[PDB]
């Protein structure tokens, strides 16, 4: 009976989520605890079976994109391992919490969808489901990591990591925070 | 005791190459300075002494599975061939390089000529392989 489930060396215990909206849609705490960000699968057979997937495995899935990198899973596993090493070095505490706080702070709470016919860009402000909030958060963080780790000397390990610290508090110099603010202001525009 | 299968092969091939360099009994040919190891390679090997590492890899591959000749080992040390505009394809290595390595290990007292078209290990070669496996295991532990 192991009292703690390390991700190699990182504890999955004693993490707290400040948002009660994403308490059951973020899977880190004592039931969804593995030792790798690499699940067996069968998480996309029904509608809501992807909510039981661990969030490190969801970011591991959403990291690979753009044709060249499709199908590479072990490589993404070691990239997010080195990324969590950088989060632990730059802050000093559990990197699972910074992953939790970045997802809450980068999920768009409002959105604008198309309405009516073509000819004019008329939109209606709507609400966002909490599953779409974490989906947009993971997709925006992975897109910002991909845009930062392109045509630069900076490696993917730092360019996955230091945006999470910027998205932990919203320092107005990250990709996901800027696009979430843009989405919120354009949803407030057509209100 | 300890065998070759109980220790990682990555440090093992380097240690066996270093020991086989230290023995100095391999009768290495003269055109190894300017040669390509396969038809699909682009440059010369970056290592200064590729022959000792190739001979060590040949010896340990013969230990894991014997009875393999020259043409059987060309399938092992070969890979993807980039033809440029073409879609890529698999291609073999250099037959004469592996043949010279096999003649080197036959002239040195490690590899004998096995029956039914193969080359097996002399038990002195097994002694050397198990002894250096023990030394690498003791250095790691």
């Amino acid at each position: 009976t192991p009292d703690i489930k390390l991700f190699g060396k990182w504890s999955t215990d004693d993490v707290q989520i400040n948002d009660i909206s994403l308490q059951d849609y973020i899977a880190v705490k004592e039931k969804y605890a593995k030792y790798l960000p690499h699940s067996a699968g069968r998480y996309a057979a029904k509608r809501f079976r992807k909510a039981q997937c661990p969030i490190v495995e969801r970011l591991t899935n959403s990291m690979m994109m753009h044709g060249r990198n499709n199908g590479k899973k072990l490589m993404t596993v070691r990239i997010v391992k080195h990324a969590f090493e950088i989060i632990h070095l730059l802050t000093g505490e559990n990197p699972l919490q910074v992953l939790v706080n970045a997802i809450i702070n980068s999920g768009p709470r409002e959105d604008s969808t198309r309405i009516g016919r073509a000819g004019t860009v008329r939109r209606q402000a709507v609400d966002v489901s909490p599953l779409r909030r974490v989906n947009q958060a993971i997709w925006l963080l992975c897109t910002g990591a991909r845009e930062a780790a392109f045509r630069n000397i900076k490696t993917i390990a730092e360019c996955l990591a230091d945006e999470l610290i910027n998205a932990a508090k919203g320092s107005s110099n990250s990709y996901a925070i800027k696009k979430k603010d843009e989405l919120e202001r354009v949803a407030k525009s057509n209100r | 005791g300890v065998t070759v299968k109980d220790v990682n092969q990555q440090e093992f091939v380097r240690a066996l190459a270093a020991f086989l360099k230290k023995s100095g009994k391999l009768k290495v040919p003269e055109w190894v300075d300017t040669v390509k190891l396969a038809k699909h390679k682009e440059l010369a090997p970056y290592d200064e002494n590729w022959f000792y590492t190739r001979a060590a890899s040949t010896a340990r591959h013969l230990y894991l599975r014997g009875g393999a000749g020259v043409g059987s080992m060309t399938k092992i040390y070969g890979g993807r061939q980039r033809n440029g505009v073409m879609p890529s394809h698999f291609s073999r290595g250099s037959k004469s390089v592996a043949r010279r390595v096999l003649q080197a290990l036959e002239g040195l007292k490690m590899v004998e000529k096995d029956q039914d078209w193969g080359r097996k290990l002399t038990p002195q070669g097994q002694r050397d392989l198990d002894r250096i496996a023990g030394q690498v295991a003791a250095a790691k532990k």
Binding site: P2, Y35, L36 | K5
Partner: protein
Amino acid sequence: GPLQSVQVFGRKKTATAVAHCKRGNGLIKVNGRPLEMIEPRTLQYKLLEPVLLLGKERFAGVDIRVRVKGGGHVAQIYAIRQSISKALVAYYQKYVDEASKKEIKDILIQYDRTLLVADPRRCESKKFGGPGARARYQKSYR
């Protein structure tokens, strides 16, 4: 006395892993190599899941020899991690009281379902008119 041996298979896609559990000292190896050194090294803890999940006192009374063929790498790793658990459960059912089987099986299913059951997922046939089983060639108009 008489030998107490079981032979239990395990597959993911086509890589079968047959484990041979018998009475002896506690040491685990596959293909002559221990579980600590199987390439790729990324799936090392995934290979080590039953031992650290279950306890070293459970594997103390048995040693395991596994012969494999087929598949790739990740399918082989999943085949080992299924086959070790299924062979251990079958050994405890065969020669130990059933309460140990219940106490090992409930936590084994509680961690992940695929430790004891296989994955019913194979590749389907590619059809004409496209480069894959579902995708089709590009259509040109005008």
